[model samples]
Target chain A: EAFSFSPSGFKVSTVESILGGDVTTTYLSSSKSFQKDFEALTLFINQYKVEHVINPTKEVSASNPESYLANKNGYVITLDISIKNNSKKDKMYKADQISLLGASKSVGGSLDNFIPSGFHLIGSSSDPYNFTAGKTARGLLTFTMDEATYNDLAKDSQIGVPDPSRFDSSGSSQDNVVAPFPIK
Target chain B: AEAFSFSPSGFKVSTVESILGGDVTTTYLSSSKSFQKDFEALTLFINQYKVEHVINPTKEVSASNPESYLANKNGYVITLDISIKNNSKKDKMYKADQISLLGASKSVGGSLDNFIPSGFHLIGSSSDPYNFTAGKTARGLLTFTMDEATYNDLAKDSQIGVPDPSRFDSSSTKGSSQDNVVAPFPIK
Candidate 1:
């Protein structure tokens, strides 16, 4: 996936893919794109700096890449994330982030029911990646996007909401929320 | 060859040969040694190239180890059979430890988040490594498990409708029926 910048620095690149298997990925992009309140969405993800919430007992640094590993087998990146309800419900949970690397050479693979049963993925940056109560309480977090996509989009104006179509997952739009990394 | 520890340590599955009443089976898969060597060498080399190898903290790992076997130990699968036998229909399934699955394939992040089975440990220090136990029951809390990830991915909810919901549901019906049919002291 590629990203181009405007003078204003609103990153735009439709270079991502989200899958939960046989469920059409187009559904993900179209749905997210269609419902996006881009201004509000950008503020949400950018509003909160990606901070790694450490369990009181464990010492973890979210910003420290040195503390983590990028897998060699294939596009699976795991990171410790403290999933908080961020609401007043007195409910919160923390689970690891396992993002499939999409926007690369592969058309991509899907993990149906991405989050394990009996758990919920209640927090996400925006409506594009909003939380919906599962059909059954046991299934939460319907799908996971390629973490690589987050990385590109997470960069400043170089790939921020104002630039272009921030989520061009299908390669259809010119804006990528995050910039692309150099391929080795 | 590096050694790995197995847990729960002893229940095993096997085939007995030359028995009149029972059928004996030797179920094993074979691969050419040369092929395996070639595969292992390339695999380990690439994996070592990518793993974030910091000075490990565990007392068991030594930086000066001569074998260099401390490198990523991938490609091992462990199997166990000592799961809770629901004969009494009283046990509840729970995970004893967090499980992680790792790979050298490299399409996304190579490590699996919660892919490892609970109460399980890999043979090495890397967050993701392989376990060598097979045939013997592994030590860990007992729980019922199936690949729910795969089921939701390829079958039912896919081109094929989800199999009878029961395939995914864990109820004691099957075991219950067998227990009832066998009645007093039945052995098979």
Candidate 2:
């Protein structure tokens, strides 16, 4: 899939593959494009304000600073992802399906750095993203981290940390990078 | 088995098949061309109709829930499993968005301005508009929320009007005079 990040502060990319079947050696290489897609996504994550906070609620501020400090795997991230449909036809996009390499570079990925398990939904837009020609839909997605070995992805302008209270996810390993994280 | 029917703008609603308390259900008769709108020919049918009386499940008018205050005040969820088919040679579009639910005291009397909405909840088929290319049919569910008093009043006479025929009269497309059918038993 080819890609471009727009001035409107959104990313546009087209995927030509679907990931299915059991995990195997072929599954690792056959889904190479899927890996590239996430890598592209990772670059986007690095550029934007991927707000990281402890006991993060859907609101702009932390709901429970104490809980965030008490638990090693209680960090949550909020992302404002805008999608533009440059294609000629309408497209269906699911923003929650966005995942990332959590804790390790080779252990596959989850949407957040929550160890063992990665993320759970705090909130998201309910409307389906059905964009007509040259249309865009901005969706807000919030996920809570269970642990952390992942790098600090917060933007420099933003104030947050590597979550010193983060725990280890038992060094989880998996072959499938395209597998959906079990978060709502 | 009593049944009621109506034909509006060539769209024929064959029966008020059933009504269970807050739930009023119906089915549509098969027809090649039942309705015409926006230079498009169409057919409409129902596969299911159900009503959920959450607030006044016991059929009590005094039931109350602070969290679900509105629903308790006006109890009933009307859902219709419907399918629309495009019969034109050219591809046609039908958006459920254009459809509205109206209320009346009797089948033919009272103002047709009465509108109902489903209270609150989650998980169901979308009522969003979809394109039905030539000879294609799209199926989905349509839902409405109503108050206990209105549902009760509607039950007393057991009749309802839709699309407000007056609008069609302005457009010079008067529906057939024979387009009214009385629904039977459980529906009331």
Candidate 3:
């Protein structure tokens, strides 16, 4: 799935394929994209911060000291989130699952080896690649994107990830949620 | 597997009727293995059951595990002869500890849950880990030791219970479709 921005609105294109079958595509307007989920989610975000970094090597310091983030002297958006899953099932937590919504386009992959020290990083041993249910996890996440996409990001942007209710699964939209990503 | 600990299994409708002792007999299906997120449907058929009262354990019963068996120690005991059929493609384990005489009261939270049954081999032992082979059937003694009054009142709502996967959830359970499927008993 990919989301591209435009002056009028955002165009999100998602592709679905079944084994031995033709591919299917679904398009959603920016207006229809961020609706509240059908059912309540077990994953609740206490707070979030989004920081656009220019020089990651010097700028991306962890409270503790860790950095797998690329040394590329470009731009990247870091997502610092405090999260908790209040269910009896394990929730999926990964960089690829973490998305940064921009004014026109969105980025959804964690930059490889992009480790930053000080904070317990998501997908790290401390926060756990598999976010356990009913536990509080606070960590940093770096989303991958181009400089143009980073520059085009809007204040209305949100961070997205898989919700915890998949074990006691319900409706279609219960899988993911996007919330405000404010400037840090 | 699905709604309950057990459920109906195999192909489709598939019920066969036969003649036996001038009576009609019917056979159904079962479906197993561990607690996969997907249901391991196991069909449990209660072929027959009998209740027996005992003031003292029998020599044979006492011989099995006289030291710790509840029957050997308890002055009074009630035993249920349970004949269960496992109609599935995989072998399933029946942990009687998960079984209860629910409706009589009612996991990580089953403390207040009522009617814990004895699987007999390791009498008074909560779990028997009894294996029901795929498509096979057998009957065993599910023993219980209680005052005569409580035992007498158990004929109706107090049927056998195996508990749903998330046992003690105050919901429901079934077999094959349910494995270690918790069964709710009759309501008094």
Best by lDDT: 3
lDDT (10s digit) by residue, model 3, range A1-184 = 3322231212211111101112211211222122232132233333222333333433334331112223432233333344555546655545344445444344544433232334444433543666565675655454543344545555334454544443342311123444555433
Q: How should the candidates be ordered by TM-score, best one leading?
A: 3, 2, 1
Which portions of model 1 show Cα errors greater than 4 Å? A1-96, A102-184, B1-188
A6-36: candidate 2 lDDT, tens digit per residue: 3232221110011111111101111111111
Docking class of 3: incorrect
Show where candidate 2 strays beyond 4 Å.
A1-184, B1-40, B56-74, B97-130, B156-186
lDDT of 1 by residue, B19-108 (tens): 111222222221111110111111111100001111222223233331122122211111222121122222223221221111112111
**Alpha-carbon deviation at A49 in model 3, angstroms:** 5.1
User: After superposition, which runs of candidate 3 have C-alpha atoms over 4 Å from their true positions?
Assistant: A1-73, A109-113, A121-127, A165-175, A182-184, B1-188
TM-score of each: 0.21, 0.27, 0.30
Would you list the C-alpha lDDT of every candidate in the order shown?
A: 0.20, 0.30, 0.34
Best by TM-score: 3
**TM-score of model 2 vs. true structure:** 0.27
Provide per-model DockQ scores. Answer: 0.01, 0.01, 0.01
Poorest stretch of ten by lDDT in candidate 1 chain B: B179-188
Cα lDDT tens digits for candidate 3, B64-160: 3322232333222222333445555755555443333421211011111122222322121123335556676554443343433444444444434
Worst-scoring 10-residue span by lDDT in model 2 chain A: A156-165
Give Cα distance to truth, residue A102, candidate 2, Å. Answer: 65
